[PDB]
């Protein structure tokens, strides 16, 4: 949604472009179009998803 | 998100 | 300066205008062969002894 994605290494992250503050993938801050079929440079992660821990919970 | 988990537990 | 791969480097520009960056990963194809035809054009224009 802002910023891009990084990571140090092999952890992903999303911090804004003018600062370096890393954040956890995550659907609110991330939105969704499309599908990972004709971007290029695209890269296989999860997404944490906050709904999911409050389910059933 | 707290009163939908309480309206429908 | 601070290196920034040039896939999204166009990509904050469309977000600069007003349009979502997802447009322009699904054309990055069609903006470049734009990009380089206009640079075709641009190019004839100055040739054209004009
Ligand atoms: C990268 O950052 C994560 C976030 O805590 C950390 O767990 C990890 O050790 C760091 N290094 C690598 C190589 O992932
Ligand atoms: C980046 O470029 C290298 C060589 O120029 C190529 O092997 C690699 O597939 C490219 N990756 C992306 C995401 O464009
Ligand atoms: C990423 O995931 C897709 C589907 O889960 C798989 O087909 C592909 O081989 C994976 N690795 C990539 C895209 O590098």
């Known amino acids: 949604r802002e910023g891009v994605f990084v990571s140090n290494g092999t952890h992903w992250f999303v911090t804004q472009r003018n600062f370096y503050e890393p954040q956890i993938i995550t659907t609110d801050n991330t939105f969704v179009?499309?599908?990972?079929?004709?971007?290029?440079?695209?890269?296989?992660?999860?997404?944490?998803?906050?709904?999911?821990?409050?389910?059933?919970? | 998100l707290q009163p939908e988990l309480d309206s429908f537990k | 300066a601070l290196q920034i791969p040039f896939a999204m480097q166009?990509?904050?520009?469309?977000?600069?205008?007003?349009?979502?960056?997802?447009?322009?990963?699904?054309?990055?194809?069609?903006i470049a062969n734009?990009?380089?035809s206009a640079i075709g054009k641009i190019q004839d224009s100055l040739s054209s002894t004009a």
């Open chain 1, 33 to 57: 179009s499309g599908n990972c079929d004709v971007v290029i440079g695209i890269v296989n992660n999860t997404v944490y998803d906050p709904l999911q821990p409050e389910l059933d919970s």
């Open chain 3, 34 to 36: 734009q990009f380089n």
């Open chain 3, 10 to 30: 166009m990509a904050y520009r469309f977000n600069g205008i007003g349009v979502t960056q997802n447009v322009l990963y699904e054309n990055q194809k069609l």
